[PDB]
Amino acid sequence: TEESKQRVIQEYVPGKQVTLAHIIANPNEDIYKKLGLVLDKKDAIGILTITPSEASIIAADVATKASNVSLGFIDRFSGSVVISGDVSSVESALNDVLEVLGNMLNFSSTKITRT
Amino acid sequence: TEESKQRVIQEYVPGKQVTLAHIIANPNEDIYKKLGLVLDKKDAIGILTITPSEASIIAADVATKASNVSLGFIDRFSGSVVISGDVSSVESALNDVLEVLGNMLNFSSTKITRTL
Amino acid sequence: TEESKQRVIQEYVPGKQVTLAHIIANPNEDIYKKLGLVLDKKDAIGILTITPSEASIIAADVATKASNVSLGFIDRFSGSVVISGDVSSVESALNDVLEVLGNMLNFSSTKITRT
Amino acid sequence: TEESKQRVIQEYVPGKQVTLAHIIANPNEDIYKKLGLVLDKKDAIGILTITPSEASIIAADVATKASNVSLGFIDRFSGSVVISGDVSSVESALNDVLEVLGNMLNFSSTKITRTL
Amino acid sequence: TEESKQRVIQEYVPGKQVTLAHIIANPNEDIYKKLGLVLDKKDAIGILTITPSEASIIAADVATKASNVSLGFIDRFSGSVVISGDVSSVESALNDVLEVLGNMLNFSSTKITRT
Amino acid sequence: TEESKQRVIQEYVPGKQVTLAHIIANPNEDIYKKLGLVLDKKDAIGILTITPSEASIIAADVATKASNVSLGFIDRFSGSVVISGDVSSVESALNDVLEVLGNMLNFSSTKITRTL
């Protein structure tokens, strides 16, 4: 019942978290085309989930400086970053992103995952 | 009253969860056409709700690597993934997704459900 | 004061709930035109609020199989489903939606309401 | 610090609430024109905030069945409903909405307020 | 770990709050042009943050009746209201908005701030 | 289970917080071009996350009154502000923003961070 529920005021602010840092070694063509990507058959993708969304800019910059990856897209509204390149380059980029956001800027972090 | 309410600061981050993994065996054409789907009338569809939304990419990739399953759509903004194919292939694909996201990536998961 | 407020991290996920399952027997023409509907004067509408939003697809399919209702619209982003038909057909459709989502899929549910 | 914060999973669902039911008796023309309204300069407006957003349809229907009240707009996405007409008719319509949503559908409700 | 987190269902509704009521005496031209404003060099702006978003309509109406301010914009989706005029007119408008929303309608309120 | 979950009504309002105030000294051109920026290749950028979103207007105004700093963009919907200029000027501007919002307006604040 309406009458039995506690009510609280919640003041919302974004957290600081990298929720996902995932490599897909051999992505299906239908999927990556729907994402707007232009890849070689040999290319892997790396996928990041980041809050606050503006920190996507930091991650994308770190990833592209880290190694030989291309920026697939950055979405500064949602926080999403997708990168592409060889598996080892994508792994190094994701590791650098996690070191900067997680260790340097004290975001809540995660380990790299892979399909 | 305004004066009696507790106030908390909530720092929001996305959870890690597959909330829904549902099969519709013989979907109504008006529904699937409004979703932008082109199906055979023996096709089933599979529907996924995923958080964070980016993990839809993972799920769609895992599902469409499944035999005889086609991507309906992926919405990387909302997390949604809809797939299509014969009912058994669709169930297999959904289960692959739950195994990758739930077991390997430690997402909260759900059982596959179906419209009877 | 800022300093006196507890802070918690909230990881958000959608709930599983049908919040509203409502019949309007004789809807005002201005309203249903603004909603994009094409009705007979005799048609009722049924309105559903559903989380997660993708479950709108399940509800719409169940409703249209249940009885002689037309799909007014489905909004897969918000979860909304509006159906139209005679009152008894709309009632049977809403009941079927509630049985499937509420009883079969264990969503939090509600009773049919009417204006 | 990051390390000291409690972490909870929150499953979100819409509440059932009319947060605002407000009359503006003689609204400024620059405001009502920015809202897309065409009024007589004796018209008042009535403003509703409703959750879940779909219940705006219910409220708009109840309000516009009220004598001498016109629909300004309905926003089924946000829940908003704005109506117009003479001040007493607008108040009557708002009260009808609060009676249906608050009393009959058990929404949390509010009192009608007005810009004095 | 996933397994260690408490889960609660949160039913969301908008709060009633004026979070910000701020005057910028001499706004930078680049900023106010990006906001779509047409000002004199001498004009100040007032900025309001309001929940629920529909109460922006009430605030904008009160502000424009209060004093000699122009409505810069109203955003009924987010709640935002920006007004412009001389500093003293903008201050009187903001004070009237706070008296109506805060004192009359019992919104949680704030004091006027200035740059 | 559905039956075991506590249920609370949460009335949402925006917090008052600068979550991020970050300098990138030599940003990659593919990144800054995707953000719509035109820079010199000695320019740094400064990135702000602000709640409530309207306070981006305050921050952008304070920052661009700083010497040798240009507005990259302001997003009044999300709260974001990106600025550009030589690294020291950008840091000075970010610090001015933290002083106004954090100290004078009592927002929760953060330290300036930088990509090393």
Numbering used by the authors:
A (entry chain B), C (entry chain B), E (entry chain B): 2 to 116
B (entry chain A), D (entry chain A), F (entry chain A): 2 to 117
From the paper:
To understand the structure and function of the C. difficile eut bacterial microcompartment we have determined the crystal structures of two proteins with homology to BMC shell proteins, CD1908 and CD1918, and show that they are well conserved between species. We have also determined the atomic structure of CD1925, a member of the EutQ family of cupin barrels. The sequestration of ethanolamine metabolism within a BMC is thought to protect the cell from the acetaldehyde produced as an intermediate in its breakdown and to prevent the loss of this volatile compound and its carbon from the cell.
Two molecules are present in the asymmetric unit, comprising the complete native protein sequence, less the N-terminal methionine, with a single amino acid visible from the C-terminal His6 tag in chain A. CD1908 displays a permuted BMC domain fold, with a four-stranded anti-parallel β-sheet flanked by two α-helices on one face and one helix on the other with an N-terminal β-strand extension. The protein forms a hexamer with pairs of molecules related by the crystallographic 3-fold axis. A glycerol molecule from the crystallisation condition was found associated with each chain. The N-terminal face of CD1908 has distinct patterns of positive charge on the surface, with a shallow depression at the centre of the oligomer that is approximately 10 Å in diameter and blocked by Glu11. The opposite face of the protein has a distinct conical cavity that is 25 Å wide at its widest point and has Glu11 at its apex. The role that CD1908 may play in the structure of the BMC shell is not clear; unlike EutS, which is able to form enclosed compartments when over-expressed alone in E. coli, CD1908 and its homologue PduU form no higher order structures.
